[PDB]
Amino acid sequence: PKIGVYVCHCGVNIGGVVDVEAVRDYAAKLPNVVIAKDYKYYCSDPGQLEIQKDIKELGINRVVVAACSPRLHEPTFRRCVEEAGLNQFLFEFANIREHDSWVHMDNPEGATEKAKDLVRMAVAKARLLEPLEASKVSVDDKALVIGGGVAGIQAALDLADMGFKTYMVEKRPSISGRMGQLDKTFPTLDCSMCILAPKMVDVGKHDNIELITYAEVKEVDGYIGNFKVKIEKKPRYIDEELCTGCGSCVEVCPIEMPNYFDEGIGMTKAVYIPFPQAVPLCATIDKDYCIECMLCDEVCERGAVKHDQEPEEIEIEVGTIIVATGYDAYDPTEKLEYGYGRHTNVITGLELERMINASGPTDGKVLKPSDGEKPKRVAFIHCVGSRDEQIGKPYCSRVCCMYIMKNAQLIKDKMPDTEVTLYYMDIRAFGKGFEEFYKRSQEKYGIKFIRGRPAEVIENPDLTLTVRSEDTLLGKVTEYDYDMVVLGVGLVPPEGAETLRQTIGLSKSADGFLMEAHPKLRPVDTLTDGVYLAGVAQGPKDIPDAVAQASGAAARAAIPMVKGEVEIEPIIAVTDSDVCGGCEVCIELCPFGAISIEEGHANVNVALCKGCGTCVAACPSGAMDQQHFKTEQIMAQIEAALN
Amino acid sequence: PKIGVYVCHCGVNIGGVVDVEAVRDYAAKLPNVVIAKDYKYYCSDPGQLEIQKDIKELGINRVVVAACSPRLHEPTFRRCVEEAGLNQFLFEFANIREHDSWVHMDNPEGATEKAKDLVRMAVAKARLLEPLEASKVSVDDKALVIGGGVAGIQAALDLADMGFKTYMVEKRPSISGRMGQLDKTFPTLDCSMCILAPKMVDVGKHDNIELITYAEVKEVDGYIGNFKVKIEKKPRYIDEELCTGCGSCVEVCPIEMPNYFDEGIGMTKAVYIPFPQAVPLCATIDKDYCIECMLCDEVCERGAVKHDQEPEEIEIEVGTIIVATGYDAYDPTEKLEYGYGRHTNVITGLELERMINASGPTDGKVLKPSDGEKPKRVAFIHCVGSRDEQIGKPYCSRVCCMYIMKNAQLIKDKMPDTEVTLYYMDIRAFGKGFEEFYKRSQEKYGIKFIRGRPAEVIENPDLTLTVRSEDTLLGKVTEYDYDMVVLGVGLVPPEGAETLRQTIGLSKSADGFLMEAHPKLRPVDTLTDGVYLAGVAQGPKDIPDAVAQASGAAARAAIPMVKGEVEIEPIIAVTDSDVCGGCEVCIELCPFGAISIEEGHANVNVALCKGCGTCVAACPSGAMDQQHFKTEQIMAQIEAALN
Ligand SMILES: Cc1cc2nc3c(=O)[nH]c(=O)nc-3n(C[C@H](O)[C@H](O)[C@H](O)COP(=O)(O)OP(=O)(O)OC[C@H]3O[C@@H](n4cnc5c(N)ncnc54)[C@H](O)[C@@H]3O)c2cc1C
Ligand SMILES: Cc1cc2nc3c(=O)[nH]c(=O)nc-3n(C[C@H](O)[C@H](O)[C@H](O)COP(=O)(O)OP(=O)(O)OC[C@H]3O[C@@H](n4cnc5c(N)ncnc54)[C@H](O)[C@@H]3O)c2cc1C
Ligand code: SF4
Ligand code: SF4
Ligand code: SF4
Ligand code: SF4
Ligand code: SF4
Ligand code: SF4
Ligand code: SF4
Ligand code: SF4
Ligand code: SF4
Ligand code: SF4
Ligand code: SF4
Ligand code: SF4
């Protein structure tokens, strides 16, 4: 063993506290060490060049680096040594920055002694290291996209245009997500369906996209490039291949049920098409409401009605997964002071979006729920379900300000005589053109802004609503009457989010949305390799941000599939057949079942083993041993820590 | 000619105003028309299937669609007819929605008559159409990335990992952009350099990336897949291949000049390295300050100093371009009431970022410019250079709120006894974890928030600063004294932005940043094919949004390069040699020089012609004629409009 030690100054992060001169000499004087050097920034290109030159010249076969935590830069130095010809796993890392220099600033002498001890432990471990060849595994060039909203549609189209065969699983009968439910979009007031429908048709026609709507992902197993996914397609009771979406079955159906697309304010039949631009344009029967009258069977000319349909099980093999499951609107029923669900003329922002839509339940007319007449006075309340510790929702929903202003502008254009007032804490018009939109809400449409979080909404006997709120800029309490009140509800993770998160094995952030690998530089990656996030799945945001995230997720998922191969770490259990007695107290301790028994000896499957070391710690005789974490290595480290 | 006419209801967008029954019968009765049908949504899959079935059955050779504007759905129907075997350009579009139904709502009868006339004109044009084969052109599988900030670095790394050879042009001597200048990042307060430097090294080592720093893009010519780019590499007067970045030349240099990296508050030598983590780690001589003393030549051991270096011209051929040129910080000198550049202890947010940086000019100490001592009282002013019509800056800069709160928190941690007050209009903490960060600024660090836009900053004789501002929530004027005032300057397009925009040929938005193809669904595309935007080039935003945009831009630019081919529209000039007299009054009228003279006859180059039709309109005898816009076709349309 010819150990080369490299102590990093990291500028003054280590050097400021730890004497990189004494440590270097100590390392040079330790047994088996043939060189000790220090450099200002080893992770940089000059430092890696120095390490490679030292390996080439002095013939170092073991490399020890006294630098930051291995979790940051272990792969960097592993590749550095690889490019110089040395084996990947002859390398050792000493943590003297996060564990020594940054936590013992007031004890420089103790810090230097701790650094000496840690480098001694690292060299003790490095003495007994041996080469290990890492196995390559093929990466399937297929992707799964969960969620058929704007983000999911964008991700699927980008992957399919790059040549990868993509599956798109959607739990609703049709794709579109929440963007299909909007009438217009801010800040341009353009029609959302007019621009989304072509993309939906594209997804429906793409040769590289397999669209599975009305389906859920039930099981996910495996790893990057090698995901096995079990999907459950719910029974439509309509044949997708035969149905043309004419709608005669809907015409004849006698039963009426709520339309999920209309968000509780629209009705359809037990057999329904969610909206005219649905993709696939196919009928669906909800058996909770079907009475099995067979009128739809008799009126259908394609023979597409199948009352004996069963749920179908699909198994796919993919290489990457993109979660694009969006969000649900906050339910403000728990805000008792605002009276949602109790007062007749209190509605939410999404319900208003459905109501203002020309294709919505009311044919685009904003009408009071109480009497079906246009309101003359409308109040909007910001931050409902957001920025509120009384309900455990301390985050901003990021879009409610803008869509509140947009819907106020739309109400003004449709009914210019209407009076509109917004109750806000902050106006968060941060995006491109958002501040101009905010100013236009006042200058052009005459919308009134009151800086005050309403205390209460009181329903009067005539069903009008008094908003009781302080005007904080006038510094006085106001009680103003309105014919309609619209709650600016925030965004929450969708129903069934935890089930899918556990199925895939992802973590979630403090707000309840899925967590990205790094907040700053890996916004669309997760810590699970081969799984990516796009859109509001990662947190509330508007359509362009979700689309950018979907494109980025497509690129990130394409990178490994283009590479076609990934490396498996060889830190795995190995059994000594000559020592193993076949006691088998190790097999059950493997959560992945990597250990079996062949010829009376324990045998580990590399594909199943993950390298936890539990079995090795359990083995009394020591027949089992983990590569790179052998018992002798840890024992040497323990001995060096105290001697 | 067997013309099939298809009138779209578009739901009620046309049908509501225009009688799609009378128009269909009129079309059926017109000469050469063999079928007339109407469908609720023709652009949808069922409508395209209907059109294809009609073409296959009745043998239609001309297709006319009375629907929305051609600029929206002409490619859709072109591909629809292609997939049924018909030629792409036998297709005609009548605009009866944007031009008739949506603009004559109060005259339904006049609307229907106008629709009849427009369909008659469309059929008149379609009678004389003929097939045209479109030529394919290869797409170069190479990309250029302009700008070496976080967005540009991300885009280049994503493209290079997908296998494409990428050029990265950077005007500064080193990559990093503005993220390298930050000390920490919000909302996590993690070190920005610690996470950016590995990416910079990766860019510097990638086999698929050619990094050209200290260079500018001078000329761009051509089109998607076929861009010819002329780049000018400025002379460093240091040999990049030889320089190791040791810094001895800096040690010996006698001249002192401002360091651009330190934003006007840091000094370096005439030969300088912008920062220790620079990529490439190379020296640069600024000849505005060099006195040619040759001390650097004598102290350099690599012989890397080249005082006779000249600017170099590089010509590259690429298929896609990604603009990632970032932003500049607003210069608040024009806000005379705040006294920047006049008061000693008034600084900007970016200057404070450099000052709080441990590697900055002051070694991470926040010191007053007047006396070099720590301030005891600090004020932050929000929205400086933003949301202000007095300076023509009506937009939000979107990050100043958060980095103001972050730098206040950093000042508190470094100097807990310091008092910090923020003067704000709205707190825009919209991002993930931003509202929690905002609350933590108060609960944990005790930062004071005053809702008021300061009227004035007055320098007192002792050089302290009185902020005169209304507290609007107390409703009273306040005059508070501070040792330091930090202006929360906004983001503006970088210097030289207009030159590069004109060089490429891009448009800009109202705020001055580059304009995307569609605000909602194409945030990273431009209307110039093959050119994409990433990061703050498209508008102010934070690091994760810029990184998502960079990944999306990489994916979008990869799509056409994976396809490897694009179609050229055949709407081009054609000369009748038997009629052309070689008068040549057409050649100079082509801005692209597509027309030359061979054998005494005008000859058009397809590669140069773009299809404006100017030459055809100029030709008296009619020898020149534009394909798909022939004189006979327009004359027939004129005749049908009036008869
Ligand atoms: C009232 C309102 C108005 C708005 N107005 C605007 C506006 O004007 N402009 C703007 O830019 N933004 C607006 N937004 C925000 C915008 O809707 C979002 O940015 C966008 O919808 C996010 O798209 P997405 O694909 O990430 O999610 P979604 O649109 O929610 O789509 C997610 C999809 O995933 C599906 N799904 C969920 N769970 C599963 C599962 N387990 N398996 C399979 N599929 C699943 C859902 O059914 C859905 O189809 C508005 C939001 C609201 C509430
Ligand atoms: C004081 C301050 C603090 C901030 N703090 C944070 C924070 O804590 N967290 C956060 O997420 N964001 C923060 N931001 C915002 C963040 O800096 C931006 O989101 C990010 O820098 C944008 O990266 P970019 O690559 O788009 O642009 P830039 O970082 O500006 O990089 C653009 C690059 O293009 C180069 N370039 C320009 N013109 C040309 C040309 N013609 N040819 C070639 N190259 C060219 C530039 O030299 C530069 O290297 C802060 C901003 C400021 C001003
Ligand atoms: S190797 Fe680690 S400690 Fe050394 S400079 Fe790099 S990040 Fe800092
Ligand atoms: S089931 Fe039959 S009748 Fe109903 S929409 Fe489908 S094709 Fe039409
Ligand atoms: S069988 Fe069910 S879906 Fe069909 S018409 Fe009767 S109630 Fe409606
Ligand atoms: S975006 Fe506006 S309305 Fe929505 S939570 Fe944030 S501050 Fe409240
Ligand atoms: S515990 Fe040890 S001895 Fe027993 S079967 Fe496992 S490896 Fe063999
Ligand atoms: S190391 Fe862990 S995963 Fe591997 S065989 Fe032993 S118990 Fe199973
Ligand atoms: S073809 Fe045009 S007019 Fe007809 S439905 Fe589609 S978008 Fe509307
Ligand atoms: S020019 Fe020479 S002395 Fe100066 S940094 Fe480069 S190698 Fe070192
Ligand atoms: S020649 Fe110029 S750069 Fe070199 S030491 Fe002299 S002044 Fe400095
Ligand atoms: S982000 Fe905050 S400080 Fe910056 S312009 Fe917008 S409101 Fe003003
Ligand atoms: S203007 Fe007409 S006649 Fe004259 S050279 Fe051109 S094509 Fe020929
Ligand atoms: S149509 Fe326009 S571009 Fe083409 S040759 Fe004539 S003038 Fe030139």
The half-sphere exposure of A514 on its side-chain side, counting CA atoms within 13 A, is: 33
Ligand 14 center from residue B583 Cα (angstroms): 16
The pair of three-digit structure tokens given for residue A337, joined into one six-digit string: 């002071």
The pairing of strands A256-258 and A320-323 is unpaired
- Which helix (H) or strand (E) segment is A551 a member of? helix A543-563
Q: Is A524 in contact with B551 (Cβ distance < 8 A)? A: yes
Concatenated DSSP letters of B463-492: S-EEEEEEETTTTEEEEEEESEEEEEE-EE
Minimum Cα–Cα distance from B554: chain A residue: A555
Residue written as tokens 């899959």? B45
Between CA B103 and CA B116 the distance in angstroms is: 16
Q: Is B162 in contact with A520 (Cβ distance < 8 A)? A: no
**Phi, psi at A598, each rounded to 5°:** -130, 130
- According to the annotation, is B550 in a ligand binding site? no
Identity of the residue numbered B137: V
Ligand 10: which of B236, B241, B246, B268 to mutate, most ligand atoms within 8 Å of CB? Answer: B246
B45, B545, B559: residue with CB nearest A161: B559
Q: Which of B480, B485, B255, B487 is nearest to B370 (CA)?
A: B485
Tell me the nearest-neighbour CA distance from A215 into chain B, angstroms: 22
Tell me the nearest-neighbour CA distance from B541 into chain A, angstroms: 8
Of all protein residues, whose CA lies closest to atom 6 belonging to ligand 11? B293
Ligand 3 center from residue A382 Cα (angstroms): 47
Whether a cis peptide bond, with omega within 30° of 0, leads into B187 is yes
A637 CB contacts (<8 Å, ≥6 apart)?
A121, A124, A125
Minimum Cα–Cα distance from B188: chain A residue: A519
Between CA A126 and CA B460 the distance in angstroms is: 64
Of all protein residues, whose CA lies closest to atom 7 belonging to ligand 6? A426
Asked if B293 and B213 count as a contact pair (C-beta separation under 8 A), the reply is no
Asked if A57 and A49 count as a contact pair (C-beta separation under 8 A), the reply is no
Q: Which of B78, B40, B55, B65 is nearest to B115 (CA)?
A: B65
Residue written as tokens 């005008």? B602
Q: Is B521 in contact with A163 (Cβ distance < 8 A)? A: no
Asked if B168 and B211 count as a contact pair (C-beta separation under 8 A), the reply is yes
CA–CA distance from B393 to each of A435, A484, B325, B336, B348 (Å)?
10, 36, 20, 16, 17
Asked if A412 and A385 count as a contact pair (C-beta separation under 8 A), the reply is no
Q: Which atom of ligand 5 is nearest to the CA of A252?
A: 5
CA–CA distance from A197 to each of A157, A169, A278, B594 (Å)?
13, 18, 8, 39
Burial A474-500 (b: 16+ CB within 10 A, else e): eeeebebebbbbbbbbbbbbbeebeeb
Ligand 13: which of B572, B574, B575 to mutate, most ligand atoms within 8 Å of CB? Answer: B575
CA torsion A253-A258-A260-A263 (nearest 10°) is: 140
Minimum Cα–Cα distance from B517: chain A residue: A544
- According to the annotation, is B317 in a ligand binding site? no
Tell me the nearest-neighbour CA distance from A315 into chain B, angstroms: 28
Helix (H, G, I), strand (E, B) or coil at B615: helix
- Experimental approach was cryo-EM
Chain A residues in contact with B520 by the CB 8 A cut-off are 185, 188, 190, 192, 195, 543-544, 547
Q: Is A555 in contact with B559 (Cβ distance < 8 A)? A: no
CA torsion A264-A265-A269-A270 (nearest 10°) is: 10
Between CA B536 and CA B514 the distance in angstroms is: 9
Chain B residues in contact with A45 by the CB 8 A cut-off are 201, 204-205, 279, 281
Burial B516-552 (b: 16+ CB within 10 A, else e): bbebbbbbbbbebebbbbbbbbbbbbbbbbbbbbbbb
**CA A335, A341, A344, A349 torsion-angle sign:** positive
Q: List, in sequence order, every beta strand (DSSP E) within A304-372.
A: 312-318, 320-323, 328-329, 346-348
Asked if A156 and A320 count as a contact pair (C-beta separation under 8 A), the reply is no
Ligand 14 center from residue B565 Cα (angstroms): 24
Asked if A473 and A451 count as a contact pair (C-beta separation under 8 A), the reply is yes
B437 CB contacts (<8 Å, ≥6 apart)?
B186, B187, B402, B405, B406, B429
Q: Is A430 in contact with B430 (Cβ distance < 8 A)? A: yes
Burial of residue A263 (number of CB atoms within 10 Å: 0-12, 13-18, 19+): buried
Residue A627 backbone zone (phi > 0: left; psi -120 to 50: alpha; other: beta): beta
Count of CB pairs separated by less than 8 Å, A with B:
229
The pair of three-digit structure tokens given for residue A469, joined into one six-digit string: 């709120």
A554 CB contacts (<8 Å, ≥6 apart)?
A154, A155, A158, A159, A162, A322, A534, B552, B555
The pair of three-digit structure tokens given for residue B216, joined into one six-digit string: 């500018």
Mutate one of A428, A515, A518 to test the B interface: name it (highest B CB count within 10 A): A428
Of all protein residues, whose CA lies closest to atom 2 belonging to ligand 11? B290
Q: Is B552 in contact with A556 (Cβ distance < 8 A)? A: no
Ligand 11 center from residue B299 Cα (angstroms): 11
Q: Which of B464, B489, B467, B265 is nearest to B375 (CA)?
A: B464
Q: Is A520 in contact with B436 (Cβ distance < 8 A)? A: no
The count of other CB atoms within 10 Å of the CB of residue A407 is 25
Q: Which of B32, B37, B95, B38 is nearest to B61 (CA)?
A: B32
B158, B426, B544: residue with CB nearest A520: B544
- According to the annotation, is B147 in a ligand binding site? yes
**CA A290, A292, A298, A304 torsion-angle sign:** positive
Chain A residues in contact with B434 by the CB 8 A cut-off are 396
Mutate one of A48, A520, A556 to test the B interface: name it (highest B CB count within 10 A): A520
> Which DSSP symbol is given to B391?
G
Tell me the nearest-neighbour CA distance from A426 into chain B, angstroms: 5
CA–CA distance from A401 to each of A203, A488, B511 (Å)?
31, 8, 21
Q: Is A432 in contact with B395 (Cβ distance < 8 A)? A: yes
